């Protein structure tokens, strides 16, 4: 139904997703509608729906940047939901990526972002990546803060704060937390045990209310050092999306 | 015509009179509603010593107009 | 002068009285000094007392 | 909150937090290494270095530097935690809702909601460092009140905060004007209804905020003239005797709790109000030098749950007893004996208050540097609540003060006679002027580049009516 | 009749005095009540120090009004 197939969008816009007419009819969506798209690792974004009949029924087209943000690859499935209660961004504070701004003279904002958002109404969410192609250069950016939170539409009157120091790229990669089950192999049994002992108490509390038991609290993992206990715990916590501490 | 009048202390009241009508009429109205002899009533607006012998026409004063009241005795 | 312990607000509140009562503080059926123990001197919010008997430096 | 809390505080705090305060050091003669690379003595000195302070004669560590110390001590980046907030104000009120199985406090209490023993110890960070008076007239007139009448006085002081380079990441409170509430002053003390005083101060504070000021402390005089022919006063307050009696400390703590300092690094978002209290008593000589103090954070949170009251001994504060709705645990004040050993002495009967204070340093701006005074005033129109003296604000005073200059011109003279605090407040109370008219009045009186604004003011109708009534009044 | 007066101590007193007697009578009332001679006291209302030679009617002092007291020998 809403599990639209992922495809490489022809356009490079960071807030546009092309869908087939049949799917548009199935979900009652329409061209220009802003919808919430969720992929993998609970990643979410807001995209403007556009009708495009070239795609096969049940397939949607998104660009490289959106796929990277959602942490999903081509051929995956994305769930699309209505996003009617999105307000216009009162103030968006954004800083560029240092490596992408090397050798840029003059005001970066006026050169690149000033025409990108004006008369665009692009919905932006915190932690997303958007890329602007200006002149002979292409620069990626980050949505550091959006008011109202956590996401909003960048209107013409929206105030954009580009002041701030460059953001290093290495932070995102070398700090590669939010690691899913795809980074762990050969320990499916213990991973399943931890999942059944952690996720269900948190993700579906009503089960134990219906049965009427107090779920167990403590869990003690042990084994030889260097077997990835910390990695397993981190992966489970990130997959659950809970307040890991 | 609707008008506002504020006393020395700050009490504010609303009165009605025709613009072309002489300000003497408004002074007499205020007096009769507060027993203030005409001489005891001095009306001020934009630093002007308003006097009974005129109307609101000559002072370019219309509806929604605010005036101040003072006693000619020695001050407030 | 009189402001050295015996003035206004020192007679409204018996500061000497408090000190003497603390001295002879027993069921039992003037001078003010600092030879003894303190007794709770409570005044309502918004009152300041500057009438404590002065002490002067070591000289 | 997955990171630092989001909240807005003063600009001074923001700019301070921007900096780092690292104190550079050069190659010591004790280093054994090449030019590059630093061992243990060439490393930059942290802003909170205790040795540097006591070597420079600085007694407390400039709270912002304390925040830097706490952030460095913990909160590793990118891992290790989820940002446990570093600062938290003390709270001694017993949790009325704990319920391990026990009932509320009045008839039941477990070992988890029992206020543990409180260990008083002299504070080390002073929120506000240097209290600075723009013009000596501000306090000279205040003392002049006592000079004429002989009774004591008391007044709140308005102003604003700013940086203070002389101390690592330090702050100064610049006081622009003093406002006197209605008090029933006497010889040995003073009395003032709290309710009426706060009611008046609410609107006075609103107007001051409209002017850009803010309430940053209270100043009172403890002055008693000696028998000397010239002006000499006994020094009742020094190391031998008390600095601030128990009652003054209690009042200062109440005021501090009633003006919280909004901060971004606490669970509640506020910590250790910036509210300096100053006292005038006279140094060892016959001078009338002033002082400054600020009650420590514990005393701030120790008096919210009652637990302290004044005592007949000036330098000691009496302790209350337990009862329903008020639980008072044992209090230990920890000093250091002459042999350099910390000693805990139980003080239920009474304890000195010197463990509930932190000292500041008063001063005046250099008399040959830039003058950014908002008000060239403090010698003119009578101050507000000096009814007891011959002073009395009224129409004839305004006629005698600002009629000859107003009727002729001298826009420089008009400006210098129009930027007075109390005069502005009084004419505002007159209500002769409209809202935006008064806004332009204040913008002309308390700002530079004031030509066009004063011209607009005079050109207005309200000012014309005001001068007309002034002329009419004797 | 009913008037309010801000005292020097900083409080307000409600005094009962008819509007058809000289202000000197009001001064006598206050000074007798609290013992401060009226030879030095002065009244203030609307910035108009009230001269002793006139009564309440001249100023048309409305009921439940308010004045201020000041001291000057
Ligand atoms: N599937 C995996 N199973 C075990 N170790 C893994 C796996 N994937 C990666 N590793 C590596 O094994 C190490 C696991 O470290 P770990 O033993 O969890 O540390 P700790 O001592 O904190 O428990 C890391 O170097 C990690 O990169
Ligand atoms: Zn070295
Ligand atoms: Zn409990």
Q: Does residue D471 sit in helix, strand or coil?
A: helix
**Domain definitions of chain E by residue range:** 2-71
How far, in Å, CA of D206 to CA of D218, rounded?
A: 17
Check: CB of residue D292 under 8 Å from CB of residue D362. yes
How far, in Å, CA of B44 to CA of B22, rounded?
A: 15
- Touching subunits for chain B (3+ Cβ pairs under 8 A): D, E
Q: Which two tokens stand for residue B50?
A: 């308003």
Please name the member of D388, D396, D398 whose beta carbon is closest to the beta carbon of E8: D388
How far, in Å, CA of D201 to CA of D195, rounded?
A: 10
Based on its alpha-carbon atoms, the radius of gyration of chain A, rounded to whole angstroms, reads 21
How far, in Å, CA of D323 to CA of D383, rounded?
A: 46
Q: Which two tokens stand for residue D60?
A: 């407390």
When scoring B40, B43, B47 by the number of chain D Cβ atoms within 10 A, the one with the most, hence best to mutate, is B47
Q: Which two tokens stand for residue C31?
A: 């001078």
Residue B7: closest CA among D463, E14, E12, E59: E59
How far, in Å, CA of D410 to CA of D402, rounded?
A: 12
Q: Which two tokens stand for residue D247?
A: 């009652």
Which is it for the CA torsion D171, D174, D179, D180, positive or negative? positive
- Which chain A residues are within 8 Å of D8, Cβ to Cβ? none
How far, in Å, CA of D274 to CA of D260, rounded?
A: 8
| CB half-sphere exposure, D68, CA atoms < 13 A | 21
- Residue A225 Cβ contacting ligand 1 at under 6 Å: yes
Q: Does residue D397 sit in helix, strand or coil?
A: helix
> What is the interface size between C and D, counted as CB pairs within 8 Å?
103
- Which residue reads 């988890």 in tokens? D112
Give the closest-approach CA distance of D408 to chain C in angstroms: 47
Check: CB of residue D138 under 8 Å from CB of residue D364. no
- Please name the helix (run of DSSP H) or strand (run of DSSP E) that holds residue D177, with its range, or none: strand D170-179
How far, in Å, CA of E22 to CA of B71, rounded?
A: 19
Give the method used.
cryo-EM
Contacts of C51 (CB under 8 A, 6+ apart): C3, C5, C7, C9, C10, C15, D187, D188, D189
How far, in Å, CA of A121 to CA of A50, rounded?
A: 14
What Å distances lie between residue D390 and D180, D386, D393, D429, CA to CA?
16, 8, 10, 20
How far, in Å, CA of D10 to CA of D214, rounded?
A: 12
- Which chain E residues are within 8 Å of B36, Cβ to Cβ? 60
What Å distances lie between residue A151 and A39, A84, A90, D58, CA to CA?
17, 13, 10, 48
Burial class from Cβ neighbours inside 10 Å (0-12, 13-18, 19+) for residue D385 reads buried
User: For the sheet containing D341-346, what is the strand order?
Assistant: D118-120, D331-337, D341-346
How far, in Å, CA of A85 to CA of A152, rounded?
A: 9
* Chain D contact present for A244, CB below 8 A: yes
- Residue A84 Cβ contacting ligand 1 at under 6 Å: no
* Chain B contact present for E20, CB below 8 A: no
DSSP assignment letter at D459? H
Contacts of A117 (CB under 8 A, 6+ apart): A154, A158, A160
Q: Enumerate the β-bridge partners of residue D175.
A: D133, D159
* Chain D contact present for B2, CB below 8 A: no
A23 known ligand binder = no
How far, in Å, CA of B62 to CA of D454, rounded?
A: 28
How far, in Å, CA of D81 to CA of D11, rounded?
A: 29
Among all bound ligands, the one having the nearest atom to the CA of D327 is 3
DSSP assignment letter at D131? E
What Å distances lie between residue D155 and D39, D181, D197, D220, D360, CA to CA?
54, 6, 11, 6, 19
Name the residues around ion ligand 3, CB cutoff 5 A: D 98, 110, 112-113
Q: Enumerate the β-bridge partners of residue E34.
A: none
- The number of beta carbons lying within 10 Å of the beta carbon of residue D62 is 25
Check: CB of residue D327 under 8 Å from CB of residue D314. no
SS3 annotation, D209-243 = HHHCCCEEEEEEECCCECCCCCCCECCCCCCCCCC
Residue E60: closest CA among E20, E7, E4: E20
- Residue A127 Cβ contacting ligand 1 at under 6 Å: no
Q: Which two tokens stand for residue A200?
A: 């269900």
- The number of beta carbons lying within 10 Å of the beta carbon of residue D247 is 23
Contacts of E58 (CB under 8 A, 6+ apart): B73
How far, in Å, CA of B8 to CA of B72, rounded?
A: 12
How far, in Å, CA of D309 to CA of D303, rounded?
A: 9
Based on its alpha-carbon atoms, the radius of gyration of chain B, rounded to whole angstroms, reads 11
- Please name the helix (run of DSSP H) or strand (run of DSSP E) that holds residue B48, with its range, or none: strand B48-50
Residue B48: closest CA among D317, D464, D158, D61: D464
Q: Enumerate the β-bridge partners of residue A238.
A: none
Check: CB of residue A117 under 8 Å from CB of residue A158. yes
- Which chain C residues are within 8 Å of D186, Cβ to Cβ? 8-9
Residue A20: phi and psi, rounded to 5, are -75, 155
Judge: E47–B76 Cβ closer than 8 Å, yes or no.
yes
| CB half-sphere exposure, A91, CA atoms < 13 A | 4
Contacts of D108 (CB under 8 A, 6+ apart): D102
Q: Enumerate the β-bridge partners of residue A74.
A: none
Residue D2: closest CA among C6, E36, A209, A150: A150
Check: CB of residue A139 under 8 Å from CB of residue A108. yes
Residue D16: closest CA among D50, D67, D61: D67
How far, in Å, CA of C48 to CA of C31, rounded?
A: 23
DSSP assignment letter at C11? T
Judged by 3 or more CB pairs under 8 A, whether A touches D is yes
User: For the sheet containing A34-38, what is the strand order?
Assistant: A3-5, A77-82, A34-38, A44-51, A16-19, A60-61
Check: CB of residue D180 under 8 Å from CB of residue D77. no
- Touching subunits for chain D (3+ Cβ pairs under 8 A): A, B, C, E
Check: CB of residue D42 under 8 Å from CB of residue D32. no
Q: Backbone breaks in chain B (C–N > 2.5 Å) follow which residues?
A: none
Residue D471: closest CA among D413, D391, D395: D395
Judge: D78–A171 Cβ closer than 8 Å, yes or no.
yes
Check: CB of residue D285 under 8 Å from CB of residue D294. no
Q: Which residue in chain B has the smallest CA separation from E66?
A: B9
Q: Does residue D163 sit in helix, strand or coil?
A: strand
How far, in Å, CA of D225 to CA of D159, rounded?
A: 30
Chain E residues 48-67 with CB within 8 Å of chain B: 48, 58-60
- The number of beta carbons lying within 10 Å of the beta carbon of residue D87 is 19
Judged by 3 or more CB pairs under 8 A, whether B touches A is no
How far, in Å, CA of D108 to CA of D99, rounded?
A: 9
How far, in Å, CA of A46 to CA of D242, rounded?
A: 66
Strands D350-352 and D358-359: unpaired
DSSP line for chain E: -EEEEE-SSS-EEEEE--TTSBHHHHHHHHHHHH---TTTEEEESTT----TTSBHHHHT--TTEEEEEEE--
Q: Which two tokens stand for residue A123?
A: 């919905």
Residue C49: closest CA among A217, D250, D412: D250
Judge: C47–D247 Cβ closer than 8 Å, yes or no.
yes
Judge: D184–E10 Cβ closer than 8 Å, yes or no.
yes
SS3 annotation, chain A = CCEEECCECCCCCCCEEEECHHHHHHCCCCCCCEEEEECCCCCEEEEEEEECCCCCCCEEEECHHHHHHHCCCCCCEEEEEECCCCCECCEEEEEEEHHHHCCCCCCHHHHHHHHHHCCCCEEEECCCEEEEEECCEEEEEEEEEEECCCEEEECCCCEEECCCCCECCHHHHHCCCCCCHHHCCCCHHHHHHHHHHHHHHHHCCHHHHHHCCCCCCCCCCCCCCCCCHHHHHHHHHHHHCCCCC
How far, in Å, CA of D120 to CA of D331, rounded?
A: 7
Residue D292: closest CA among D444, D139, D414, D152: D139
How far, in Å, CA of A93 to CA of D291, rounded?
A: 45
How far, in Å, CA of E46 to CA of E48, rounded?
A: 5
DSSP assignment letter at D107? G
Q: Which two tokens stand for residue D332?
A: 């230990």
Contacts of D453 (CB under 8 A, 6+ apart): D440, D443, D444, D447
Residue E70: closest CA among D389, A244, D384: D389
E2-71 CATH fold: Ubiquitin-like (UB roll) (3.10.20)
Burial class from Cβ neighbours inside 10 Å (0-12, 13-18, 19+) for residue A175 reads exposed
What Å distances lie between residue A142 and A100, A155, A176, CA to CA?
11, 18, 17
How far, in Å, CA of D390 to CA of D398, rounded?
A: 15
How far, in Å, CA of D132 to CA of D141, rounded?
A: 16
DSSP line for D295-328: --HHHHHHTTT---B-BSSTTEEE----BTTB--
How far, in Å, CA of D250 to CA of D267, rounded?
A: 26
- Which chain B residues are within 8 Å of E55, Cβ to Cβ? none
First to last CA, chain E: 28
Out of A228, A229, A232, give the residue to mutate to test ligand 1, the one with the largest number of ligand atoms within 8 Å of its CB.
Answer: A228
Check: CB of residue D279 under 8 Å from CB of residue D219. yes
How far, in Å, CA of D73 to CA of D75, rounded?
A: 7
Torsion angle, alpha carbons of D79, D80, D85, D91, to 10: 170
My answer on whether omega of the bond before C50 falls inside 30° of 0, hence cis, is: no
- Please name the helix (run of DSSP H) or strand (run of DSSP E) that holds residue D278, with its range, or none: strand D276-280
What Å distances lie between residue A127 and A43, A130, A242, D254, CA to CA?
10, 10, 18, 44
Check: CB of residue A184 under 8 Å from CB of residue A191. yes
Contacts of A177 (CB under 8 A, 6+ apart): A234, A238, D79
Atom number, ligand 1, closest to the C-alpha of residue A225 = 17
Which is it for the CA torsion D197, D199, D200, D205, positive or negative? positive
- Please name the helix (run of DSSP H) or strand (run of DSSP E) that holds residue D280, with its range, or none: strand D276-280
How far, in Å, CA of D284 to CA of D234, rounded?
A: 8
Check: CB of residue A221 under 8 Å from CB of residue A195. no
Judge: E47–B74 Cβ closer than 8 Å, yes or no.
no
Q: How far is CA D3 from the centre of its chain?
A: 31
């Amino acid at each position: 139904d809403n599990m639209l197939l992922v495809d490489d969008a022809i356009n490079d816009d960071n807030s546009v997703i092309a869908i087939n007419s049949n799917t548009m009819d199935k979900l009652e969506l329409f061209r220009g509608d802003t919808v919430l798209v969720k992929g993998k690792k609970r990643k979410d974004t807001v995209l403007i729906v556009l009708i495009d009949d070239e795609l096969e029924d049940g397939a949607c087209r998104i660009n490289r940047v959106v796929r990277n943000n959602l942490r999903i690859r081509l051929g995956d499935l994305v769930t699309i939901h209505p996003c009617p209660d999105i307000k216009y961004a009162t103030r968006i504070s954004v800083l560029p990526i240092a490596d992408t701004i090397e050798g840029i003279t003059g005001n970066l904002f006026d050169v690149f972002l000033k025409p990108y958002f004006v008369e665009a109404y692009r919905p932006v969410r915190k932690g997303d990546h958007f890329v602007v192609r200006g002149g002979m250069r292409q620069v990626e950016f980050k949505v550091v803060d959006v008011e109202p939170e956590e996401y909003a539409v960048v209107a013409q009157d929206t105030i954009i704060h580009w002041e701030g120091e460059p953001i290093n790229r290495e932070d995102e990669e070398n700090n590669m937390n939010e690691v899913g089950y795809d980074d762990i192999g050969g320990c499916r049994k213990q991973m399943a045990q931890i999942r059944e002992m952690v996720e269900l108490p948190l993700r579906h509390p009503q089960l134990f209310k219906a049965i009427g038991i107090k779920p167990p609290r403590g869990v003690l993992m042990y084994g030889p050092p260097g077997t990835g206990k910390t990695l397993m715990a981190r992966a489970v916590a990130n997959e659950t999306g809970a307040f890991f501490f | 015509m609707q008008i506002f009048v504020k006393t020395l202390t700050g009490k504010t009241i609303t009165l009605e009179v025709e613009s072309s009508d002489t300000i003497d009429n408004v002074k007499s109205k205020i007096q009769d509603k507060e027993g203030i002899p005409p001489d005891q009533q001095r009306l001020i607006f934009a630093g002007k010593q308003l006097e009974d012998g005129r109307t609101l026409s000559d002072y370019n004063i219309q509806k929604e107009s605010t005036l101040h009241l003072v006693l000619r005795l020695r001050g407030g | 002068p009189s402001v050295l312990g015996q003035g206004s607000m020192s007679t409204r509140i018996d500061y000497a009285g408090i000190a003497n009562s603390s001295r002879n503080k027993l069921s039992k059926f003037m001078k003010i000094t600092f030879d003894g123990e303190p007794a709770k001197l409570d005044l309502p919010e918004g009152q300041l007392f500057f009438g404590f008997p002065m002490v002067l430096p070591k000289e | 909150r997955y990171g630092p809390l989001r909240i807005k505080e003063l600009a001074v705090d923001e700019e301070l937090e921007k900096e780092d305060g690292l104190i550079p050091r050069q190659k010591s003669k004790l280093c054994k290494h090449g030019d590059r690379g630093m061992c243990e003595y060439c490393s930059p000195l942290p802003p909170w270095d205790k040795e540097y302070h006591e070597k420079n004669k600085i007694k407390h560590i400039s709270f912002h530097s304390y925040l830097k110390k706490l952030n460095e001590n913990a909160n590793k980046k990118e891992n290790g935690s989820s940002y446990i907030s570093p600062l938290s104000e003390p709270d001694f009120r017993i949790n009325k809702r704990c319920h391990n199985g026990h009932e509320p406090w009045p008839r039941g209490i477990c070992s988890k909601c029992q206020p543990s023993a409180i260990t008083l110890q002299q504070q080390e960070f002073r929120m506000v460092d240097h209290v600075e008076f723009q013009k000596s007239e501000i306090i000279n007139e205040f003392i002049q009140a006592w000079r004429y009448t002989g009774m004591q006085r008391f007044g709140y002081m308005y102003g604003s905060y700013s940086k203070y380079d002389n101390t690592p990441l330090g702050i100064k409170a610049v006081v622009e004007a003093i406002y006197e509430p209605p008090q029933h002053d006497e010889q040995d003390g003073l009395t003032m209804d709290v309710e009426q005083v706060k009611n008046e101060m609410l609107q006075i504070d609103r107007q001051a905020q409209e002017m850009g000021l803010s309430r940053i402390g209270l100043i009172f005089t403890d002055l008693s003239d000696a028998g000397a022919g010239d002006g000499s006063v006994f020094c009742k307050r020094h190391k031998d005797s008390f600095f601030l009696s128990s009652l003054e400390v209690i009042m200062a703590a109440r005021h501090q709790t009633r003006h919280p300092n909004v901060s971004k690094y606490s669970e509640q978002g506020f910590f250790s109000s910036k509210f300096v209290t100053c006292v005038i008593s006279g140094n060892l000589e016959g001078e009338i030098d002033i002082s400054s103090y600020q009650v420590s954070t514990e005393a701030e949170a120790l008096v919210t749950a009652d637990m302290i009251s004044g005592s007949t001994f000036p330098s000691m504060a009496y302790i209350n007893d337990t009862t329903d709705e008020r639980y008072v645990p044992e209090i230990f004040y920890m000093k250091s004996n002459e042999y350099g050993i910390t000693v805990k002495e139980n003080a239920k009967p009474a304890f000195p208050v010197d463990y509930l204070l932190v000292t500041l340093t008063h001063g005046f701006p250099n008399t040959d540097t830039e003058t950014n005074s908002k008000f060239v005033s403090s010698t003119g129109f009578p101050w507000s609540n000096r009814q007891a003296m011959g002073q009395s604000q009224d129409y004839q005073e305004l006629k005698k003060y600002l009629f000859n200059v107003a009727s002729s011109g001298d826009f420089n003279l008009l400006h210098e006679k129009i930027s007075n605090f109390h005069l502005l407040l009084y004419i505002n109370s007159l209500q002769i002027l409209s809202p935006d008219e008064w806004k332009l009045l204040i913008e002309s009186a308390v700002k530079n580049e004031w030509e066009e604004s004063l011209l607009k003011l005079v050109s207005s109708a309200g000012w014309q009516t005001l001068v007309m009534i002034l002329q009419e009044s004797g």
